[PDB]
Design a protein around this ligand. Structure first.
Ligand SMILES: *CC(=O)[C@H](C/C=C/C)n1cc([C@@](C)(NC(=O)c2ccccc2)C(C)C)nn1
Length: 217
């Protein structure tokens, strides 16, 4: 496997989004993973509709819109629904709305998704190298996460219990300090232009590998 990966260099990662007052991190995590797959298939980078997931991937999928949801079952909705709309066509409003999916504005499909084994940072590495960005959960319930500005994030008080959905778009190191490159959905003013580098190979740190999945077009 490559020692370092960064899917932004391949034009597979869209601009960092801002979820605002809605608990839609799961939706941003899911669309971000599919956005990379859409680029890899079609050669076009298109932001996909997190709102579509918030409004439509609801109770049937165990999801609660702005009150939370699952990246896995969001993918299942995209499969079941035979599509997801573009963000441009179905824009994000940081609130629960009636489902307004329109297949005319379908920008991506999903045929399947793969869930990676709990805590296997080796398997996650392989997936990020060979498949694409991987939707993950993390423990972000420590002020150090919100306060993160730069460097490789290590928080001794982190648990492996996931409470925040983000997207692993690469991995690398600084002279042996290994990290996962994570795209957040708190806008570009969070961390390193909207990204956080999180400690890799330090015991499933902050649950980075607790809940990983990636879709396929
Ligand atoms: C990060 C985010 O927007 C939130 C909640 C923010 C609270 C301040 N969020 C966390 C999640 C997770 C953990 N799923 C659930 O919490 C959930 C809740 C209800 C039904 C299903 C799932 C995912 C797994 C990251 N989703 N949104």
């Amino acid at each position: 496997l490559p020692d370092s990966v960064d899917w932004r260099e391949k034009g597979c990662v869209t601009e960092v989004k801002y979820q605002g007052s809605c608990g839609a991190c799961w939706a941003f995590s899911a669309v971000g993973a599919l956005e990379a797959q859409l680029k890899l298939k079609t050669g076009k980078l298109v932001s996909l509709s997190a709102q579509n997931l918030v409004d439509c991937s609801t109770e049937k999928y165990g999801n609660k819109g702005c009150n939370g949801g699952f990246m896995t079952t969001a993918f299942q909705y995209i499969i079941d629904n035979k599509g997801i709309d573009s963000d441009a066509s179905y824009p994000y409003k940081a609130m629960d709305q009636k489902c307004q999916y329109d297949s005319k504005y379908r920008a991506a499909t999903c045929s399947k998704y793969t869930e990676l084994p709990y805590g296997r940072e080796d398997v996650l590495k392989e997936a990020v190298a060979n498949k694409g960005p991987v939707s993950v959960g993390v423990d972000a319930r420590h002020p150090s996460f919100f306060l993160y500005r730069s460097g490789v994030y290590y928080e001794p008080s982190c648990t492996q219990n996931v409470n925040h959905g983000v997207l692993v778009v690469g991995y690398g190191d600084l002279n042996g300090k290994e990290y996962w490159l994570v795209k957040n959905s708190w806008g570009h003013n969070f961390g390193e232009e909207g990204y956080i580098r999180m400690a890799r190979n330090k015991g499933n740190h902050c649950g980075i590998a607790s809940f990983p999945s990636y879709p396929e077009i």
